[PDB]
Nucleic acid binder design. Structure first.
Ligand SMILES: [Zn+2]
Ligand SMILES: [Zn+2]
Lengths: 235, 169, 287, 101, 59, 209, 101, 117, 82, 50
DNA sequence: CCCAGCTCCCTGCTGGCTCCGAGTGGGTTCTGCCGCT
DNA sequence: AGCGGCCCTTGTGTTCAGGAGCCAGCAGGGAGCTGGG
């Protein structure tokens, strides 16, 4: 559509669910809670395609894809145990580890595992930023994903109670045309993280840094991520 | 598909609608077709904690439903019989099931040989998820959850065409 | 109170008569004292709401009791010997497989049910082939011990156990899952009488709202009003009352659907539709 | 007699009914057209009210026919109206409420 | 006009508008163009970004 | 177990008397409104023991216009009535020279028996009824209007007035609960009088099929 | 929001007004209440449109004959008089029966 | 009463089915494939808890304390170690209408104590 | 059918009026004779309407009955309401 | 209203809330909450209209 | 002078067929290609 | 140069609107009849 610059951008950032406009079921057309930050809750046709034809958010980035070979090598080098080497008796207390849906093995101390994998992704290490690492806690599964099409968005990492985006960064980002300090150098510094929908379930976001301050009654007090700007949920 | 029969023989039977087969198949028959005849080894792949009798009592109907079969060859012959291509001779029936359980059933886990253990472990977890859902220990998955969806962009899209056409070339 | 289908879905099911509506329900009216007090009304509610052994059972357990004299359970040894000290049944035709069912006082008292009524229903649905006993209504746990009189016994017990818990109707009418009793605040459901002075008086009486539809059985019950009791399932109305009853019942359902949103439509239109759908003796669905 | 016929027809205290002509408004229109004084005595003989209503009910013919089958339908068709007519055009109401001439 | 910006509300905008000689609530007195008589109801007026759509009548 | 059975038998008998009275049969007022106590004293309150037995509940009424035009009402003891039982009643009706009867079954009726009720139609006009549907008089319902069986003379006047044929009037299935209640067959016309919020009273005529 | 938060703000209570401005969470939730309206408005058109057609084809030939009765194309009789009174729904209007209550 | 676990044979590792010795009148568990037999010790072969009186405290795991999305509170300390902070969540398990019950867990490491108020 | 006893309604229906004005207008449009006077009207519609109010339309309405009979009601015998 | 709901939540969390006849505990909780909020909306709406 | 096949009929279940709002304005693409006689 | 066939890759292959209400077909079971002992 070349009727206006907004239509072109929207058309180039358009989605489509092959459920069929003929369908009269309102469940797939409804605005699910998971359209937050990944899709515009407002941008959608009002005709016979409500909820099916969507539009990506401003900060939405669909994964391109990556091979799980290097991750499997790091895990094997780690204390992880393969699937054929283990005995079924050890699966009770041990935690599973999936990769692109393929059950690879199990682990014993998954806490320090994710802390390691997360540290690697935040340093642009073997694990790329587009890699999703979901650690279901109640269910001991740990699903890692490198497939393409996994819609994700960036978010500001959060320390114990403070952000990692200090003032020295904003300074370098202001002189972006001189010191060639761009978004990529910001991600490599471990300040920002690409979070996907499946990982948002295990993530505790903060709408603004004001929620990180000390209040008369602590609501969460254990934030782990923060939003750059809530307006980014719009298309 | 790994389904559970609705209540109304004695209990709820678990089956498996494998590809290239037009008839439901008990999960135990599939486990035996992969080289696991002992019910203990089978449950060890499905149930990881034998101290949970609630899950063991829920899978018992499937065990008692398929107990005449106790070898890998007979299980493969049964699977081939349930399909729409029942070979007159039991030899090719086993061959048809062997290549089906090796190529069409869970290709992402592996299509080569000697991977029967990986398929069983995954098929066991596949049943483990079904028991947890029926016992309420886990919430059902939402079809609209985009964490369970994928966006096919030009990359994964154009690749499908080039692959199909390169074959034609 | 209950979820009722309204709007186009309810308007649809009427024009295309459906044998399995989404929210079929009854409008039970009581006749006498049950219409005023709540204790007697609850008794009627329990006499309609289908109650299976699964609704009042807490946990079942099958044991292998070779001799009822010295049972495997220790807390059931007091009343078992009080029943076995005298030969009431054919002890020779006894099986060592026991089926000890444990009920709950809450669900049992909420329905004014007793192990006695349960024993007769069991001895009736299975005759003497399945001997059943029970303790008094004084113990802290409601228990009734069952045996098979003479597939294997243990397998047969689990068969009737899982089956009896589903098809054995202790009390109520099948096809009616739940029933809701309430006092109608609207005058359209109250009992409008004519006092001796000639004035209209709206009495606030209890009425029951069911999740199923069984008119032939519900109407044939004591303390139930055989004049005002109706339903929304136009199918049951035609099979029980006739074509003229479903004609009016169909008109009432359409009026309720159209008037629920405060709108209003002339009656001459609803009548023409209901008449065209009944001018041939059968429910001529608009399809 | 009509009073009981309505009780069996309308078991609920719902007098709101749909009918062709509004008598309360036509009477009001007559009051203003002829300048009726509600404080002065009326010159309307009550027998003329009764005779007029009876003659009117016969002029309203939903069914044409003198046979007993048609007369029963006509009596049943204009029933609800003839009732609302006799209750609004009553001799007493026209003397102390409307006071028409 | 960022959607979620607590630093901009309707009150602050109203106070800033009262400094330029206009009603803090945007209203303004209008005069009927046919007769010049004032309009009893102080009309609301201001700049608003409007768009023209390709759906014309000639097409 | 027992007090409820006698209650059902009484309610069924009361409904039958109301039914026979609506068809035009001579039924005394005393038995038309018979309290549960009066029934227990006249028949008993122990059907399980055999007092009263369903065979004693047999009713025999006569038409008001024709005394010899009688009607039977039988209460078989077997829940599912078979063809053998119908032959017994058909034989009994032949002895007493009666042509109408009513069979009030408990559970149901076999298919072969139903066919027997159809082949003997011109000779013996005998119908079947379920006690579960006779415990209530449907005509007393608010939705069920007042039905009236018309005579061949009244119908001829009806068709001649509106100038229409029988196939033009609305239809009512012969198997309709009301049609069975009034004992009407194909060809008969039933006049329904129902209240109307637009006209007060509406008289319609339905043809049986 | 935290897990298992049935509070008002977590389950979609818009405690702010359209003038004071909606928060991000309250805005997303408000879109759901609206999107549900668009879906219904976009889905009922087929079901409702299909009903309007079904009702017509069944009652497209029903007409008031010259003998005041309602008959269909087959000449069958559905109502001896339209609406049981032979009156049109235009001139009628609501009234009140005085001899009922 | 409690549920009953499956018993496996010692020869073919198959499930043992229940059986009665008519001669000795004793409960036995035999394999439907081989000729193995075992003398039962529980005497109960089946248990169905319709009420579903399941203690969720056994289904919960101490690792749940590492969830940042769970709410923490200092009003309910741990009874095994005395820690103040503790995470609380609902049952969220089907077949339990009274799911609003809160289940607490101690956030202290290596303790993993669980309870309910 | 006996014309002496016509059971149909004595008033002209809105549809009978419509077709009468229409058919009569066509005749006037075809330079047919006029029955009543005319001041300055040149439209067949205004001419036909005045003829109805004057009750001087030479047309007969054959009201068909369901049974098959018919009743010929002249425009002059019917009572115009609107 | 937000304080009342917090009390209702505390009651159900402490098992101090019983279900109503014909409704589940969860349905009762949601009904009470929906009532409190609906009442606040009506109360606030009236205050604005005045 | 009972009785087990044999026939007839009715229940119930499964599977197959039809239906899925009214309109309107633009656009592109395509209506063969290849093997054999 | 014109007539014949057919590309859906798994010859064996995925959903080409999928899902909600009548209707035809067949398995199943109970009643009743009837020629044998
Ligand atoms: Zn063994
Ligand atoms: Zn602790």
């Amino acid at each position: 559509n070349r009727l206006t610059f907004a239509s072109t951008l929207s058309h180039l950032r358009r989605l489509n669910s092959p459920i069929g406009r003929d369908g009269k079921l309102a469940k797939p057309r409804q605005l699910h809670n998971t359209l937050w930050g990944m899709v515009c809750p407002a941008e959608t046709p009002e005709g016979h395609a409500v909820g099916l034809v969507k539009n990506l958010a401003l900060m939405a980035y669909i994964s391109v894809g990556s091979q799980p070979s290097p991750i499997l090598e790091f895990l094997e080098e780690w204390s992880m145990e393969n699937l054929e080497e283990i005995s079924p008796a050890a699966i009770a207390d041990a935690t599973k580890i999936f990769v692109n849906g393929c059950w690879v093995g199990i682990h014993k101390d998954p806490e320090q595992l994710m802390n390691t994998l997360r540290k690697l992704r935040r340093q642009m290490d073997i694990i790329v930023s587009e890699v999703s690492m979901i650690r279901d806690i109640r269910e001991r599964e740990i699903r890692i994903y490198t497939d393409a099409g996994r819609i994700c968005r960036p978010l500001l990492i959060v320390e114990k109670q403070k952000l990692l985006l200090k003032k020295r960064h904003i300074d370098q980002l202001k002189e972006r045309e001189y010191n060639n300090y761009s978004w990529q150098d910001l991600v490599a510094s471990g300040v920002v993280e690409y979070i996907d929908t499946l990982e948002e379930e295990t993530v505790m976001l903060a709408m603004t840094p004001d929620d990180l301050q000390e209040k008369e009654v602590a609501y969460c007090s254990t934030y782990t991520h923060c939003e750059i700007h809530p307006s980014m949920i719009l298309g | 598909w790994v389904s559970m029969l609705a209540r109304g023989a004695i209990g709820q039977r678990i089956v498996a609608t494998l590809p290239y087969i037009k008839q439901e198949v008990p999960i135990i028959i599939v486990f035996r077709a992969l080289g696991f005849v002992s019910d203990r080894d089978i449950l060890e792949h499905i149930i990881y904690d034998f101290e949970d009798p609630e899950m063991m009592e829920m899978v018992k109907p499937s065990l008692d439903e398929a107990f005449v079969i106790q070898e890998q060859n007979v299980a493969l012959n049964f699977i081939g019989s349930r399909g729409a291509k029942p070979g007159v001779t039991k030899e090719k029936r086993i061959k048809y099931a062997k290549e089906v359980l090796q190529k069409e059933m869970l290709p992402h886990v592996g299509v080569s040989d000697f991977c029967e253990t990986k398929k069983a472990y995954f098929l066991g977890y596949m049943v483990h998820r079904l028991l947890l859902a029926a016992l309420g220990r886990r919430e059902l998955d939402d079809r609209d959850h985009y964490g369970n969806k994928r966006l096919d962009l030009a990359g994964p899209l154009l690749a499908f065409l080039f692959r199909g056409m390169f074959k034609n070339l | 109170a209950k979820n009722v289908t309204l709007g186009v879905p309810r308007l649809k099911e009427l024009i295309n008569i459906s044998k399995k509506p989404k929210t079929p329900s009854l409008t039970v009216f009581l006749l006498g004292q049950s219409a005023r007090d709540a204790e007697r009304a609850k008794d009627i509610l329990c006499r309609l709401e289908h109650t299976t052994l699964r609704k009042v059972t807490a946990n079942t357990a099958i044991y292998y009791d070779p001799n009822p004299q010295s049972t495997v359970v220790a807390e059931d040894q007091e009343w078992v010997n009080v029943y076995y000290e005298m030969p009431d049944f054919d002890v020779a035709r006894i099986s060592p497989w026991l089926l000890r069912v444990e009920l709950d006082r809450k669900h049992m008292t909420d329905r004014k049910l007793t192990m006695e009524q349960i024993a007769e229903k069991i001895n009736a649905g299975f005759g003497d082939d399945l001997n059943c006993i029970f303790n008094d209504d004084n113990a802290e746990k409601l228990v009734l011990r069952i045996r098979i009189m003479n597939m294997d016994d243990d397998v047969f017990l689990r068969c009737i156990e899982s089956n009896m818990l589903t098809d054995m109707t202790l009390q109520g009418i099948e096809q009616i899952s739940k029933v809701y009793m309430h006092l109608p605040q609207t005058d359209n459901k109250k009992k409008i009488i004519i006092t001796e002075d000639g004035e209209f008086k709206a009495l606030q009486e209890w009425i029951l709202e069911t999740d199923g539809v069984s008119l032939m059985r519900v109407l044939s019950e004591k303390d139930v009003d055989p004049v005002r009791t109706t339903s929304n399932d136009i199918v049951e109305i035609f099979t029980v009352l006739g074509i003229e009853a479903v004609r009016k019942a169909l008109e009432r359902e359409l009026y309720h659907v159209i008037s629920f949103d405060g709108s209003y439509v002339n009656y001459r239109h609803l009548a023409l539709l209901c008449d065209t759908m009944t001018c041939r003796g059968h429910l001529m669905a608009i399809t | 007699e009509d009073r009981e016929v309505l009780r069996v027809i309308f078991p609920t205290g719902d007098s709101k009914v749909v009918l062709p002509c509004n008598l309360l408004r036509m009477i009001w229109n007559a009051q203003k057209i002829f300048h009726i004084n509600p404080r002065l005595p009326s010159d309307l003989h009550p027998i003329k009210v009764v005779e007029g209503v009876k003659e009117l009910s016969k002029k309203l013919v939903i069914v044409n026919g003198d046979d007993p089958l048609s007369r029963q339908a006509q009596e049943n068709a204009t029933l609800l109206f003839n009732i609302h007519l006799r209750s609004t055009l009553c001799s007493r109401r026209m003397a102390e409420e409307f006071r028409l001439s | 006009a960022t959607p979620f910006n607590d630093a901009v509300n309707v009150q602050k905008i109203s106070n800033l508008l009262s400094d330029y000689g206009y009603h803090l609530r945007g209203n303004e007195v209008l005069y009927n163009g046919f007769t010049g008589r004032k309009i009893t109801s102080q009309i609301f007026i201001g700049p608003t970004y409007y768009q023209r759509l390709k759906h014309m009548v000639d097409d | 177990d027992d007090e409820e059975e006698t209650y059902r038998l009484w309610k069924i008998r009361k409904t039958i008397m109301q039914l026979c009275h609506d068809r035009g049969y001579l039924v005394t007022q005393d038995e038309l409104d018979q309290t549960l106590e009066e029934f227990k004293a006249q028949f008993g309150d122990k059907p399980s023991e055999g007092r009263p037995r369903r065979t004693d509940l047999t009713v025999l009424v006569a038409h008001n216009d024709d005394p010899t035009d009688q009607m039977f009402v039988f209460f078989p003891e077997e829940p599912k009535v078979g063809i053998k039982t119908i032959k017994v009643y058909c034989q009994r009706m032949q002895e007493e020279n009666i042509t109408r009867a009513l069979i009030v079954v408990q559970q149901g009726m076999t298919p072969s028996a139903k066919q027997s009720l159809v082949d003997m139609a011109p000779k013996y006009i005998l119908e079947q009824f379920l006690q579960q549907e006779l415990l209530i008089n449907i005509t007393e319902h608010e939705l069920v209007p007042e039905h009236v069986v018309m005579t061949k003379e009244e119908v001829t006047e009806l068709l001649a007035r509106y100038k229409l044929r029988e196939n033009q009037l609305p239809r009512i299935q012969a198997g309709d609960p009301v049609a069975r209640y009034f004992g009407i067959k194909r060809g008969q016309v039933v006049k329904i009088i129902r209240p109307s919020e637009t006209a007060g009273r509406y008289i319609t005529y339905r043809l049986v099929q | 929001f935290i897990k298992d938060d049935y509070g008002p703000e977590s389950r979609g209570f818009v405690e702010n007004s359209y003038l004071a401005g909606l928060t991000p969470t309250e805005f997303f939730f408000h879109a759901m209440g609206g999107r549900e309206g668009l879906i219904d408005t976009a889905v009922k058109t087929a079901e409702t449109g299909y009903i309007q057609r079904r009702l017509i084809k069944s009652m497209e030939s029903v007409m008031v004959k010259y003998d005041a009765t309602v008959r269909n194309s087959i000449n069958q009789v559905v109502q001896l008089r339209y609406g049981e009174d032979g009156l049109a729904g235009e001139s009628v209007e609501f009234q009140n029966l005085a001899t009922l209550k | 009463p409690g549920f009953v676990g499956i018993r496996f044979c010692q020869e073919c590792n198959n499930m043992l089915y229940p059986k009665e010795d008519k001669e000795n009148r004793i409960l036995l568990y035999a394999c439907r494939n081989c000729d193995y037999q075992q003398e039962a010790d529980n005497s109960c072969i089946y248990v169905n808890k319709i009420t579903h009186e399941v203690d969720e405290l056994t289904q919960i795991i101490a690792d749940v304390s590492q969830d940042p999305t769970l709410p923490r509170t200092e009003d309910h300390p741990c009874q095994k170690c005395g820690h103040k902070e503790a995470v609380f969540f609902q049952s969220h398990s089907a077949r339990a209408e009274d799911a609003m019950r809160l289940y607490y867990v101690c956030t202290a490491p290596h303790c993993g104590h669980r309870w309910t108020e | 059918q006996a014309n002496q006893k016509r059971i149909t309604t004595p008033y002209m229906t809105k549809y009978e009026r419509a077709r009468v004005l229409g058919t009569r207008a066509l005749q006037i449009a075809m330079c047919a004779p006029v029955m009543v006077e005319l001041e300055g009207e040149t439209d067949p519609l205004l001419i036909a309407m005045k003829e109805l109010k004057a009750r001087k339309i030479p047309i007969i309405i054959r009201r068909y009955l369901p049974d098959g009979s018919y009743e010929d009601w002249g425009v002059d015998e019917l009572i115009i309401s609107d | 209203a937000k304080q009342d709901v917090i009390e209702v939540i505390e009651k159900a969390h402490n098992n101090e809330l019983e279900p109503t006849p014909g409704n589940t505990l969860r349905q009762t909780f949601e009904n009470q909450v929906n009532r409190i909020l609906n009442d606040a909306r009506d109360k606030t709406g009236s205050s604005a209209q005045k």
